[PDB]
Ligand binder design. Structure first.
Ligand SMILES: CCCCCCCCCCCCCCCCCC(=O)OC[C@H](COP(=O)([O-])OCC(O)COP(=O)([O-])OC[C@@H](COC(=O)CCCCCCCCCCCCCCCCC)OC(=O)CCCCCCCCCCCCCCCCC)OC(=O)CCCCCCCCCCCCCCCCC
Ligand SMILES: CCCCCCCCCCCCCCCCCC(=O)OC[C@H](COP(=O)(O)OC[C@H](N)C(=O)O)OC(=O)CCCCCCCCCCCCCCCCC
Ligand SMILES: CCCCCCCCCCCCCCCCCC(=O)OC[C@H](COP(=O)(O)OCCN)OC(=O)CCCCCCCCCCCCCCCCC
Ligand SMILES: CCCCCCCCCCCCCCCCCC(=O)OC[C@H](COP(=O)(O)OCCN)OC(=O)CCCCCCCCCCCCCCCCC
Ligand SMILES: CCCCCCCCCCCCCCCCCC(=O)OC[C@H](COP(=O)(O)OCCN)OC(=O)CCCCCCCCCCCCCCCCC
Ligand SMILES: CCCCCCCCCCCCCCCCCC(=O)OC[C@H](COP(=O)(O)OCCN)OC(=O)CCCCCCCCCCCCCCCCC
Ligand SMILES: CCCCCCCCCCCCCCCCCC(=O)OC[C@H](COP(=O)(O)O)OC(=O)CCCCCCCCCCCCCCCCC
Ligand SMILES: CCCCCCCCCCCCCCCCCC(=O)OC[C@H](COP(=O)(O)O)OC(=O)CCCCCCCCCCCCCCCCC
Ligand SMILES: CCCCCCCCCCCCCCCCCC(=O)OC[C@H](COP(=O)(O)O)OC(=O)CCCCCCCCCCCCCCCCC
Ligand SMILES: CCCCCCCCCCCCCCCCCC(=O)OC[C@H](COP(=O)(O)O)OC(=O)CCCCCCCCCCCCCCCCC
Ligand SMILES: CCCCCCCCCCCCCCCCCC(=O)OC[C@H](COP(=O)(O)O)OC(=O)CCCCCCCCCCCCCCCCC
Ligand SMILES: [Ca+2]
Lengths: 121, 51, 195, 101, 342, 479
């Protein structure tokens, strides 16, 4: 397909080019700068005193519920992009069907808000 | 309500931006060290010397 | 070339998918998973399904990040040292072989062309084509999808919602209403006068 | 030359990989949720592959709805996992085992 | 040369040269962005800012860049070493990568794809993984805390980011970035640009852009006064340079999008001056100047307060706007002021 | 969507509208202070929607380019589902309040699950089948896990979600193969292409994947292992729901799929259904002997009974479908009666579920034990109970189709299964030393035991046209 070749192959080419530029910048210091590691240098930073522990412990995420609702809301908005692109050609059902779809969304959003699910645990 | 209206129109941010721009175009007191120096009074306590 | 593009995305997805399930590090599984979805999006573009290629990345970039949040929220206490695998690999190979044999002789029905509900038009861009059928011909499914998403909203809140009652909380609107003129005032304290 | 069989083979591999992840995992239920996502990704590869090679948009329409249910499934799957973690203190697969017989 | 430029090679060289043009512009602008950012804060702060390294300090960014190239790379003992180096790479690479679909003039675009808006969203959101993975892979507490804040930040500004621009797609009838610019062409210069019919979304997009770029008042993944350097605490030399480069490149992309979506891209504000890439660059640098001024005048939110803005302010407002715009466009209120499609 | 399309789906819109309005009413006007009121309005709504579906004049048709089928078969299934759902909610209302389990969202989640079931049985397209199935499945996972302080509720939801998602993935994979072969998702298009001379391995693989995915929802062996754990772990009101309404909807969906999409390859899928039915009947009967928890016993009872119902479908005839429909109707009535009694079981004010608690119950409450006796013999399939006539109908269909070997196996497994129903009767009437289980029943729960128990005998005299209604419904599907 021509559209693939003219428009999408440049994306693939530039993905490699931007990757090469980022990699060369990392390797620049890896090759030029002096490397002199010692146990104190490579230890974890906690403001001058040794860390109590590493960062591989459980940690309560007080916004966990909002993150679950983030997944749901992501899919709701996805249905709007083809609708917005097709807006000129929409039929009466196609137009008001979205309004019903968005009204059901707003009932869910009003339920979250009223329940208190948007306040952190 | 008056306070709620002003926050909706971002008045507190607009005032800050305007104040920032007034400082933006104003003279800078920065000294051009080492060409330009801070003021020293006769009483200034600096390096010791024997007279 | 199309051959090079296919195998780049095909090998990347299949290898990434394998690394998701056999690796021992759950955070590494998260990063393999996003590579699998990006590789599959590359395959979708090659076939001209660009909207679902881009939609897939948009959706699962956020969703995979949420998965990372739960991995670290419930991180096991044995991260440093994190079966019947032989028999399982045998059943997997058997199932994969059966599918390969079935796909060897794949041929659609000779009526498949005449039965297409939404034939593709070369002159119409993919996103416009989907929008012409998604909200009119499939309007019933469109509405049911909204209810499927609503059930997820209700369920998540019903199952998990709780709030600590022992921490300090502020009402943001009440914070913004605090009038400096009312909250601070000057006092004429006479000499020698205490509280 | 890349034809339909090429994409179906990729779909089959991802599908079997995702199924495999469910019944071999022992240590983490989140990785099972990832395997379910791999399994559904494999399905969408089939629907998109059949759609484009037939010249039909139904398979692409089907893919959008599979993503919708995948999102809803992940939300509910994580919510159910949250309540289990609170009740058990672990999310290891081998610990979802109190009921048996 | 005709026998050459038509071949696969002349086609392959054309893409590489086009790619170098984008890298040259974005990286060259990076020299003046870091300089200009610091000069603007200083001017608001009654001081000079960099003014000795080169004339008026104009070579300061070269000195900074070179200093990092000859600075030692320190690798934390407890860090996940592959993910540690992948995080800065993604941060810089993906921000630059998003510019492949940015048009600067009529026909001055490397990839003219139909879903350009969605591709921008895909690439910018994946860039956040550099911050999330950079913080977590360091395996120390301050970068770990910033890693969670980065995930919180994504949940805060992305939930309504799509809705904020859906109105512009409705008015345009396209996700092609060049199409959005052409929809803002008319006989009244800047009065045909989308900032006017979608004035509320300009504010909401600009604020969302600040959060997407980890910029004040939403500089929460660094937050010096709370987390020392946040996700970058354990990074040095060029790996650290890549995170800063990515931060400014992402900021520059938002400056491009603001100008493309709402201020007519390369179109002239006045009819009697010609359209061209100069107008695109002028608008991009005005919005960068707005980025710099905001850093100089605002304090920092708590990251739970950022989430309040996204879900309880921006989400209901953007959703309400989309419905309002759809009605106005559907019924061609004010003679298609919101219906720019043909 | 035309105005004729909208009229066809009006009962579904009415249910969906109620669920949305109920959600806002509960959120804004008291939350759990309305929980009791919302439960009873939902019961009325289920009955009102069933009246719309089942009463008046109906002319079979299709809506939305054939994606939604409104025929006598779908109307029979919807009515049983809605009435069974209404019964479960009504009989559980008092129990959930006493146990502090009645959230104002529980009635709404059940209503959206029933809405999904209504789209399942009227599916005329693969996408309609999927969206209806997934709306039901997602709602079922939630209520399985809704006892937040119970680790067993959490595990029941987790096992159901993971295995339900696996079955859904298999269903989708087969649905994708069927679409690729036929070029369409509509069943009228699919059936015309799937015929004797054109069955590649690919399309036969698709049928197997779809069948296995659906056979999970009726707990067919070996896609059954979720059922005992989920039945035990989930709240008893939620277990009673799983046992009655989803099984009816899922059984009708399988019949819809194999006749409206695979109706020209009956020979191919009849053998698979028969093999599922055999394994389910024997495992359910044999495994039930080893149960001491009454809720877990009902799961194996459920698996064995779905095996018998599949015998009618394995016949691949209009009579087989007619008798499968009657079987599911009688099975739902029996489970409503049984789970009404199980909910009432308690010692010292806490619910109890072990079988040993029934010892000598007949000498504690004579009328309740007599009702339980009729239900156990009805589940065992012993005359004169209406449960016997359910088995008689499916066995009639099997023999009528030249599958007497299946009927012989069916009756043999019935004998093994009869043991653990007889044992419950043994415990109640001449069991060992009693531990003081009491049956706490309000008026509604009490009628949920007696009326189904009476129906098992009164139904032996007259089925009141239900058998004739099932025959007309089966004809519209099979043709
Ligand atoms: C189609 C249109 C859809 C758009 C609207 C989406 C639906 C949102 C409704 C849900 C709101 C809700 O549950 O609260 C009702 C709110 C009561 O909420 P609550 O649970 O008591 O708590 C109060 C908030 O916590 C107290 O607020 P807060 O501290 O969380 O701060 C948020 C603040 C910020 O307020 C906002 O910014 C919200 C403004 C609403 C925007 C929607 C319309 C936009 C129109 C387009 C115009 C273009 C933009 C210019 O909003 C409020 O003060 C809440 C007012 C309720 C918003 C009503 C709309 O008032 C009602 O009872 C009204 C119900 C109807
Ligand atoms: C598209 C538009 C968006 C913005 C462009 C992108 C941003 C580019 C980055 C560079 C930012 C440069 C910041 C310059 C700030 C200079 C200071 C300022 O604002 O004026 C304040 C100063 C006044 O103080 P002084 O020097 O002490 O004056 C004493 C003396 N008797 C006098 O009057 O002086 O007065 C002066 O400094 C007077 C001289 C001003 C210098 C003018 C050139 C500035 C560069 C503009 C670049 C345009 C692109
Ligand atoms: C000020 C500097 C100039 C501002 C504009 C920057 C534009 C750079 C992006 C170039 C975009 C591009 O891909 O150009 C392609 C275009 C025609 O390519 P063609 O093959 O016909 O079409 C492609 C089909 N998809 O190609 C062209 O028509 C030519 C592209 C322009 C090349 C000149 C720009 C070189 C980069 C300058 C670097 C220095 C600027 C930075 C300094 C700081 C700025 C503040
Ligand atoms: C028939 C309508 C139900 C009325 C039930 C009467 C019971 C009285 C009662 O206490 O509850 C009514 C309840 C509103 O509760 P109320 O008690 O007024 O609240 C006090 C304020 N704290 O009311 C409710 O619970 C209302 C529940 C919602 C009913 C939805 C009605 C619309 C049906 C869908 C149609 C869709 C068509 C498209
Ligand atoms: C207010 C009204 C309440 C709802 C009643 C709905 C009535 C539906 C009905 O009668 O449907 C008729 C239908 C057959 O229709 P058709 O074949 O057209 O009949 C010839 C008509 N000229 O008939 C059918 O579809 C048959 C339906 C049989 C239902 C059997 C019961 C199902 C399981 C629920 C048991 C409930 C146990 C009791 C619980 C007590 C309290 C908890
Ligand atoms: C003490 C001794 C006990 C020994 C077992 C007793 C024999 C049990 C046989 C049951 C009756 C089965 C029968 O008569 O055959 C069923 C069927 C005949 O019906 P068909 O001709 O298909 O008519 C279709 C109607 N349109 O099909 C046939 O023609 C015959 C099918 C035979 C099915 C298997 C019978 C096995 C016998 C039971 C073994 C022990 C258990
Ligand atoms: C003079 C030095 C020029 C150096 C280069 C300037 C770069 C300009 C960036 C692009 C233009 C941005 C225009 C911003 C809008 C102006 C806001 C403003 O003047 O507010 C009123 C603002 C009121 O602030 P107030 O005094 O606190 O009320 O005006 C001023 O105080 C004077 C500032 C005028 C600035 C115009 C020149 C640009 C610098
Ligand atoms: C072997 C037992 C008896 C059966 C004899 C039949 C032999 C075929 C057995 C198939 C089992 C092996 C699995 C491979 C399936 C081959 C499908 C085939 O031949 O189709 C024709 C087909 C020919 O193409 P066509 O002419 O376009 O139909 O074969 C191919 O070339 C398909 C290529 C598959 C692509 C593999 C991608 C790998 C991704 C990276 C994974 C890591
Ligand atoms: C597409 C992917 C592009 C690359 C993504 C970055 C991730 C791959 C690099 C992981 C390197 C792990 C090396 C760890 C180690 O101990 O060696 C340090 C290694 C050894 O010190 P050297 O001998 O001075 O290089 O230090 C480095 O400078 C590593 C630089 C990594 C270069 C690739 C980025
Ligand atoms: C949200 C804020 C809404 C602000 C209301 C603006 C009213 C503009 C009505 C334009 C009516 C018209 O002729 O539309 C077709 C008209 C078509 O013009 P053409 O594209 O040049 O053919 O709409 C446009 O696209 C351009 C209209 C430009 C005139 C705007 C005048 C605003 C002045 C106040 C600025 C402050
Ligand atoms: C979402 C779930 C909640 C649903 C509750 C609201 C139901 C829909 C809104 C109420 C009014 C709808 C009246 C339809 C009028 C009609 O038939 O004529 C169309 C009418 C033209 O038909 P004509 O009269 O035959 O020319 O079109 C219009 O102008 C209105 C189009 C509205 C489209 C809305 C689609 C959503 C309804 C389907 C719900 C899905 C099932 C949920 C389970
Ligand atoms: Ca039929």
């Amino acid at each position: 397909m021509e559209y693939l070749l003219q428009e999408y192959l440049p994306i693939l080419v530039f993905l490699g080019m931007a990757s090469a530029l980022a990699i060369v910048l990392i390797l620049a210091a890896a090759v030029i700068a002096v490397r002199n590691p010692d146990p104190e240098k490579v230890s974890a930073y906690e403001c001058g005193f040794n860390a109590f522990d590493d960062a591989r412990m459980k940690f309560d995420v007080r916004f966990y519920l909002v993150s679950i609702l983030f997944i749901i809301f992501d899919l709701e908005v996805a249905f709007l992009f083809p609708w917005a692109v097709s807006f000129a050609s929409l039929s009466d059902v196609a137009f008001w069907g979205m309004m019903v779809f968005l009204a059901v969304l707003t009932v869910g959003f009003a339920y979250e808000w009223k329940k208190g699910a948007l306040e952190w645990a | 309500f008056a306070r709620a209206t002003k926050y909706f129109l971002m008045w507190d941010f607009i005032k800050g931006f305007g104040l920032g721009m007034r400082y933006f175009v104003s003279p800078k007191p920065t000294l051009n060290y080492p060409h330009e120096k801070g003021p020293l009074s006769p009483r200034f306590r600096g390096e010791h010397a024997l007279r | 070339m199309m051959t090079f593009a296919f195998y780049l995305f095909a090998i990347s997805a299949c290898v990434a998918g394998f690394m998701v399930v056999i690796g021992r590090n759950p955070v590494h599984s998260v990063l393999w998973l996003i590579l699998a979805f990006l590789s599959a999006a590359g395959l979708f573009v090659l076939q001209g399904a660009e909207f679902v290629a881009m939609l897939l990345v948009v959706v699962y970039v956020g969703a995979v990040a949420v998965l990372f949040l739960f991995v670290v929220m419930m991180l096991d206490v044995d991260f440093a040292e994190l079966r019947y695998l032989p028999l399982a690999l045998v059943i997997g190979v058997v199932l994969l072989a059966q599918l390969g044999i079935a796909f060897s002789g794949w041929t659609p029905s000779d009526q498949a062309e005449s039965l297409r509900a939404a034939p593709v038009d070369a002159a119409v861009e993919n996103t416009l084509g989907l929008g012409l059928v998604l909200y009119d011909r499939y309007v019933l499914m469109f509405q049911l999808a909204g209810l499927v998403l609503l059930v997820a909203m209700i369920g998540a809140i019903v199952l998990t919602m709780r709030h600590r009652k022992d921490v300090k909380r502020q009402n943001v609107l009440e914070q913004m209403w605090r009038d400096p003129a009312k909250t601070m005032e000057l006092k004429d304290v006479k000499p020698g006068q205490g509280l | 030359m890349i034809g339909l069989t090429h994409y179906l083979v990729v779909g089959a591999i991802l599908f079997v990989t995702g199924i495999f992840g469910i019944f071999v995992n022992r240590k983490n239920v989140i990785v099972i949720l990832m395997s379910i996502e791999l399994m559904l990704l494999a399905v969408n590869i089939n629907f998109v592959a059949f759609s484009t090679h037939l010249g039909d948009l139904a398979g692409q329409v089907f893919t959008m709805f599979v993503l919708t249910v995948a999102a809803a499934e992940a939300a509910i799957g994580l919510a159910i996992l949250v309540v289990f973690f609170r009740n058990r203190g672990t999310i290891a697969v081998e610990d979802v085992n109190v009921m048996k017989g | 040369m005709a026998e050459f430029w038509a071949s696969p090679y002349g086609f392959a060289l054309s893409m590489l040269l086009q790619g170098l043009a984008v890298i040259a512009f974005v990286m060259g602008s990076l020299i003046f962005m870091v300089y200009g950012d610091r000069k603007i804060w200083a001017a608001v702060q009654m001081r000079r800012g960099p003014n000795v390294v080169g004339p008026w300090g104009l070579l300061q960014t070269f000195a900074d860049a070179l200093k990092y190239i000859v600075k030692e790379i320190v690798i934390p003992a407890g860090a996940d070493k592959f993910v540690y180096f992948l995080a800065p790479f993604l941060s810089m690479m993906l921000a630059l990568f998003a510019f492949v679909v940015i048009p600067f003039d009529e026909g001055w675009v490397m990839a003219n794809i139909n879903v350009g808006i969605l591709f921008i969203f895909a690439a910018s959101s994946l860039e956040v993984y550099g911050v999330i993975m950079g913080g977590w892979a360091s395996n120390s507490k301050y970068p770990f805390l910033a890693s969670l804040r980065s995930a919180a930040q994504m949940i805060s500004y992305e939930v309504s980011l799509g809705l904020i621009i859906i109105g512009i797609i409705i008015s345009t009838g396209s996700m092609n970035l060049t199409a959005i610019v052409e929809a803002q062409r008319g006989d009244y210069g800047l009065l045909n640009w989308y900032w006017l019919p979608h004035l509320p979304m300009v504010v909401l997009f600009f604020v969302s852009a600040l959060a997407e770029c980890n910029r004040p008042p939403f500089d929460l993944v660094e937050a010096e006064s709370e987390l020392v350097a946040g996700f970058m605490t354990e990074y040095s030399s060029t790996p650290y340079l890549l995170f800063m480069a990515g931060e400014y490149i992402a900021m520059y992309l938002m400056c491009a999008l603001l100008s493309l979506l709402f201020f007519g891209g390369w179109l002239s504000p006045v009819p009697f001056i010609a359209d061209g890439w100069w107008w695109m660059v002028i608008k991009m640098w005005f919005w960068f100047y707005m980025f710099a001024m905001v850093k100089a005048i605002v304090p920092r939110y708590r990251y739970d307060q950022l989430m309040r803005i996204g879900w309880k302010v921006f989400l209901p407002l953007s959703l309400g706007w989309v419905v309002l715009v759809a009605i106005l466009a559907r019924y061609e209120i004010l003679g298609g002021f919101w219906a720019r499609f043909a | 969507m035309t105005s004729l399309d909208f009229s066809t789906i009006l009962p579904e819109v009415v249910l969906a509208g109620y669920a949305l309005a109920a959600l806002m009413a509960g959120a804004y006007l008291g939350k759990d202070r309305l929980a009791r009121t919302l439960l009873w309005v939902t019961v009325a709504a289920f009955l009102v929607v069933a009246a719309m579906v089942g009463l008046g004049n109906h002319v079979d048709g299709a809506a939305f380019h054939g994606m939604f089928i409104d025929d006598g078969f779908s109307r029979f299934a919807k009515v049983v589902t809605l009435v069974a759902a209404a019964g479960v909610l009504a009989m559980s209302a008092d129990y959930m309040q006493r146990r502090n389990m009645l959230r104002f969202e529980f009635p709404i989640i059940v209503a959206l699950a029933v809405l999904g079931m209504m789209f399942m049985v009227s599916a005329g397209d693969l996408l309609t089948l999927y969206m209806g199935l997934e709306l039901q499945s997602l709602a079922l996972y939630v209520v399985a896990a809704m006892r937040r302080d119970s680790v067993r509720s959490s595990e029941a939801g987790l096992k159901y979600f993971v295995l339900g998602s696996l079955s859904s993935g298999l269903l989708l994979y087969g649905a994708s193969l069927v679409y690729g072969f036929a070029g369409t998702t509509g069943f009228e298009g699919i059936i015309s292409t799937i015929e004797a001379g054109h069955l590649s391995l690919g399309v036969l693989f698709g049928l197997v994947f779809m069948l296995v995915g659906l056979s999970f929802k009726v707990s067919a062996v070996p896609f059954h292992m979720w059922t005992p754990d989920v039945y035990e772990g989930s709240p008893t009101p939620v277990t009673a729901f799983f046992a009655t309404a989803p099984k009816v909807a899922a059984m009708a969906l399988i019949a819809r799929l194999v006749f409206d999409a695979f109706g020209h390859v009956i020979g191919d899928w009849s053998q698979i259904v028969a093999a599922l039915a055999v394994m389910s009947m024997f495992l359910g009967s044999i495994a039930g002997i080893g149960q001491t928890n009454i809720k877990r016993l009902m799961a194996y009872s459920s698996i064995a009974h779905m095996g018998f119902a599949l015998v009618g479908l394995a016949a691949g005839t209009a009579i087989g479908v007619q008798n499968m429909l009657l079987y599911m109707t009688i099975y739902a009535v029996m489970n409503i009666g049984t789970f009404a009694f199980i909910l009432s079981m308690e010692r010292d004010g806490v619910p109890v579920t072990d079988l040993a608690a029934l010892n000598r119950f007949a000498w504690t409450d004579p009328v309740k034990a007599l009702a339980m006796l009729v239900l156990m013999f009805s589940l065992a399939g012993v005359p004169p109970t209406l449960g016997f006539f359910a088995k008689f109908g499916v066995l009639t269909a099997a023999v009528d189709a030249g599958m007497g070997w299946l009927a012989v196996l069916g009756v043999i497994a019935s004998v093994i299964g009869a043991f653990y129903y007889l044992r419950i009767v043994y415990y109640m009437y001449f069991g060992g030393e009693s531990e003081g289980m009491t049956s706490r029943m309000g008026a509604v729960q009490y009628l949920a035991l007696m009326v189904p128990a009476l129906a098992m005998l009164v139904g032996a005299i007259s089925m009141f046209g239900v058998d004739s209604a099932a025959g007309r419904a089966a004809e519209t599907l099979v043709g």
